[PDB]
């Protein structure tokens, strides 16, 4: 439905060019039709099959048989931490064991992402002069190309920025938590009728209620790699200081949302699941699709309606849904969306946050007329269901500019108000559920099913299994990043080491901006209370006379099998610090360059243990005290 004249100007007014031309027809079997995006949610084959691949990744990394075998050891270790009454985690409870499994897997992925960001910040600061050169000199090139240049000019250890490259280099602890696999083959619905016998409580303690089962079956975790975050950070940065501020600003928001996601399962209410509505007739002249996204790790949802070639969206609050309607009040409007449309409902799990989903929706709305209907649906469904960035470079650039804007201080959505409000809604819901269950059944039964111990993800006392790949002189080193902290109070860190040898000595060192501590222990199969901290309101800590925001803990042990680090706050429900923004992150600066230094346990001496500063050591050889 359009032809062009030969020997005419190739320039066009529009900046985003559709693969199918203005005729809106692509001959099948051509290259243009081959590189067209594919609908994943709409196509039953691709949605069915995608779930198979995600299930395989979860099962290969985390095995249900392994988790059930380690339940007894974990229960003993959690009892070894002598916690005040009303604050102990009792893994013999079926419900409490479930939340630990979800919490442990979710925290480990978040913790690993923070570690990768720390090394990335270290590499950027090391090459400040050449990083500032690339940012200032080149501005017309694409954000992806700028990200590739930055990762090349630094020792990023992950040069690829594409989605295929990101999946190629990814640890076992990063793969998202697949909810259905966790809840498989687990007893539901123990009926104990007016029996307070100790045997009756024991069997009831062994099962879970049906509400918890629905929550797990509609749960999927989102963890954003630092390589995907570099594009929004470097799209408008003019200096390395600005770029580092953006990187920390985004991960602070992702930090808050991940904590919020876990609290939804703890509260004791059924979390809604995202769905897509399609017309009943597959071969319909008038085509419309509706997407309702309910991010579990977030506080704001998104409804995207594509009617013909017109795209409209609405952002709604996930709190305050007192009425029968699932959607709360709408915070940002982008047209009129009809959620009463009748059609086939297909359920899906999003692998991108609300910010990333919103960023693409604004970009598509800008290019509503330039792109065809298939391209609009394909790009949107690929990003939502696969976290795959569009091949259209012009569209990709616009998405990342919007991603930066929603994160920066000039965002149309004030996230702190909504994140704070969601926290208040969740705790109020938990209180209402507990008292409602207190009237129906006994107080003992209520504590079984909805525990008051867990609450938030980082408030909860969780364990993080560490993986070690570096061994020096027979001593394998296990890394753990202490901090940052979203809550203030007194916090304790413990380490458990199991190894084949009957007796052994293992060393733990804690790196700050000044120097290490060099603790040495010999106990096995029991937590050791390695180090104890205090956290200010702003999240900073005066560690040995210097304010710190994060520390690096390294554990050295010979012929070890598993090393676990436990964490517990002194008081239950530690109050949360305000989430940092771009201004807060650039206002103060800490040096993490010292975290890569490592010691050799084999050559250690008695005088070396204790708090030592860098001046005491000479250049290199951070193990021997004499300079």
């Amino acid at each position: 439905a359009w032809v062009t004249q030969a020997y005419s100007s190739g320039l066009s007014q529009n900046s985003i060019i559709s693969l199918t031309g203005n005729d809106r027809t692509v001959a099948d079997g051509t290259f243009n039709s081959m590189i067209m995006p594919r609908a994943v949610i709409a196509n039953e084959r691709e949605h069915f099959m995608k779930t198979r691949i995600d299930k395989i990744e979860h099962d290969l990394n985390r095995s249900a048989k392994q988790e059930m075998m380690d339940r007894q050891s974990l229960a003993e270790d959690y009892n070894a931490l002598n916690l005040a009454v009303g604050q102990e985690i009792k893994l013999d409870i079926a419900t409490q064991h479930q939340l630990n499994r979800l919490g442990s897997a979710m925290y480990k992925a978040d913790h690993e992402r923070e570690t990768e960001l720390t090394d990335l910040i270290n590499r950027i600061r090391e090459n400040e002069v050449t990083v500032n050169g690339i940012l200032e000199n080149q501005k017309a090139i694409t954000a992806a190309e700028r990200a590739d240049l930055l990762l090349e000019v630094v020792a990023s250890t992950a040069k690829s920025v594409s989605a295929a490259g990101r999946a190629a280099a990814d640890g076992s602890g990063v793969v998202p938590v697949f909810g259905p696999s966790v809840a498989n083959g687990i007893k539901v619905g123990i009926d104990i009728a007016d029996s307070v016998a100790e045997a009756a409580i024991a069997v009831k303690e062994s099962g879970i209620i049906t509400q918890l089962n629905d929550v797990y079956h509609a749960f999927q975790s989102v963890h954003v790699a630092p390589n995907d975050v570099i594009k929004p950070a470097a799209v408008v940065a003019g200096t390395s200081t600005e770029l580092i501020g953006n990187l920390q600003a985004i991960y602070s928001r992702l930090r808050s949302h991940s904590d919020i996601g876990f609290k939804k399962a703890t509260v004791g209410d059924v979390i809604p699941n995202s769905y897509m509505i399609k017309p009943v007739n597959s071969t319909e002249y008038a085509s419309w699709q509706l997407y309702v996204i309910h991010p579990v790790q977030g506080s704001l949802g998104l409804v995207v309606q594509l009617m013909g070639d017109a795209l409209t969206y609405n952002v709604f609050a996930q709190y305050g849904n007192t009425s029968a309607s699932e959607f709360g009040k709408t915070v940002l409007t982008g047209g009129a969306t009809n959620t009463a449309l009748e059609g086939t409902k297909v359920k899906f799990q999003t692998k991108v946050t609300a910010q990333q989903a919103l960023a693409l929706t604004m970009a598509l709305k800008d290019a509503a007329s330039m792109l065809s209907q298939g391209e609009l649906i394909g790009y949107f469904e690929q990003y939502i269901n696969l976290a795959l960035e569009p091949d259209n470079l012009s569209l990709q650039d616009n998405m990342h500019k919007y991603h930066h804007l929603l994160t920066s201080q000039n965002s149309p959505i004030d996230w702190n108000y909504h994140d704070e409000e969601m926290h208040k809604w969740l705790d109020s819901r938990k209180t209402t559920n507990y008292d409602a269950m207190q009237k129906k059944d006994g107080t003992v039964i209520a504590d079984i099913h909805i525990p008051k111990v867990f609450n938030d993800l980082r408030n909860t006392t969780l364990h993080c299994k560490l993986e070690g790949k570096q061994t020096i002189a027979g001593y394998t080193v296990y890394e753990y990043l202490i901090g940052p902290w979203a809550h203030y109070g007194d916090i304790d860190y413990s380490v458990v080491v199991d190894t084949l040898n009957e007796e052994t000595k293992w060393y733990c060192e804690v790196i700050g901006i000044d120097g290490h501590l060099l603790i040495e222990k010999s106990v096995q199969h029991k937590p050791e209370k390695i180090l104890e901290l205090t956290v200010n309101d702003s999240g900073v800590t005066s560690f040995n006379g210097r304010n710190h925001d994060r520390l690096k803990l390294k554990v050295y042990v010979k012929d070890s099998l598993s090393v676990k680090v436990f964490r517990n706050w002194i008081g239950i429900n530690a109050p949360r610090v305000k989430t940092k923004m771009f201004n807060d992150h650039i206002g103060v600066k800490y040096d993490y360059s010292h975290f890569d230094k490592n010691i050799s346990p084999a050559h250690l001496t008695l005088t070396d243990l204790g708090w030592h500063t860098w001046d005491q050591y000479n250049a290199g050889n951070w193990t021997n005290i004499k300079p």
């Binding site: 084949l500 040898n501 009957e502 012929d559 099998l561």
Partner: peptide
């Protein structure tokens, strides 16, 4: 079972 772990446990049992 890993080779090292079998050797380690055999050493524990015998000695």
């Amino acid at each position: 079972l890993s080779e090292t772990e079998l050797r380690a446990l055999k050493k524990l049992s015998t000695t």
